[PDB]
Subunit: 170 residues, 2 copies
Amino acid sequence: ALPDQSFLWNVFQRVDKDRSGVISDTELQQALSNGTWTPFNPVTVRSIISMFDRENKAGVNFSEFTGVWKYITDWQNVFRTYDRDNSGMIDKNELKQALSGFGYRLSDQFHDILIRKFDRQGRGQIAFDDFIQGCIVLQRLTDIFRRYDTDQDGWIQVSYEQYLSMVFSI
Amino acid sequence: ALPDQSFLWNVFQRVDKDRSGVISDTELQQALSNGTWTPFNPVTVRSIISMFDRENKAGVNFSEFTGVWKYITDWQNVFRTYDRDNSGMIDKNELKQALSGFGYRLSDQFHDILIRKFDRQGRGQIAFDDFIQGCIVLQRLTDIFRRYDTDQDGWIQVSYEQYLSMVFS
Ligand SMILES: [Ca+2]
Ligand SMILES: [Ca+2]
Ligand SMILES: [Ca+2]
Ligand SMILES: [Ca+2]
Ligand SMILES: [Ca+2]
Ligand SMILES: [Ca+2]
Ligand SMILES: [Ca+2]
């Protein structure tokens, strides 16, 4: 949160290309770097817009952008903490450390399912945007799971329908 | 399966615009109409290609396309059967009739969830392409569920991991 408003408003005006006073997903995406030289995951860019857009306008204003800026800044720090070999991509073992550090207790084999599902380069090494994405979706599905797991034991009983409106809970 | 090879090979060559001898995901999209004046759902088009693509060439050849052609024809027929008020879009009541006719036994309120998830127009009326997608995904997930539901009673017990591992489908 270190920078002043002057800095972050100069940043805002820069990212707000059409000068409409609202940063759109399209504009945020161009501001963001995933390190790989490919456009920042658009699904992730939209996830971040609607987390910080309160007044439903498919965008963020200056005040909400300062939160966007902080949310991105915090994720970057997390990324570099668990990017131990300094490669700019998170691998399976790095992902195991990151998720364990988030308090997740998940088997080895599952981390492969994770990389497969969220790695867009298909190299088995996760870029900054796909790591945010994988994580946003994890925390989303844990919440859903905790809604149902009344004794929080990590096991639930579901009907076929309950089950289906959980996979359509995403 | 009523037209001759001549007919469907003529079709094939029109759709096969770069003439590589393989119909790709892009070229089939331009062949398909959803009725709504928008590009045929590209995910569905992807699903249909890799259902019929056996040589993993991100596309289909002539023989495989004849199957693509039949698969789409069968779907058009199903769509028209349940499109009962003749509007070109499946509504909730029509969707309840279709799914029940497929042998699904689902509650009223679940049909709202299905429409919201797969109606890419956002009017609560489902176009041809989104009805295929809805249905593809439905039967795809019924299969996942039946792998786990040992006594096929319609109830499973899942761990948080099993849950995530099967929800990533
Ligand atoms: Ca703008
Ligand atoms: Ca690394
Ligand atoms: Ca429980
Ligand atoms: Ca071609
Ligand atoms: Ca209708
Ligand atoms: Ca009719
Ligand atoms: Ca059972």
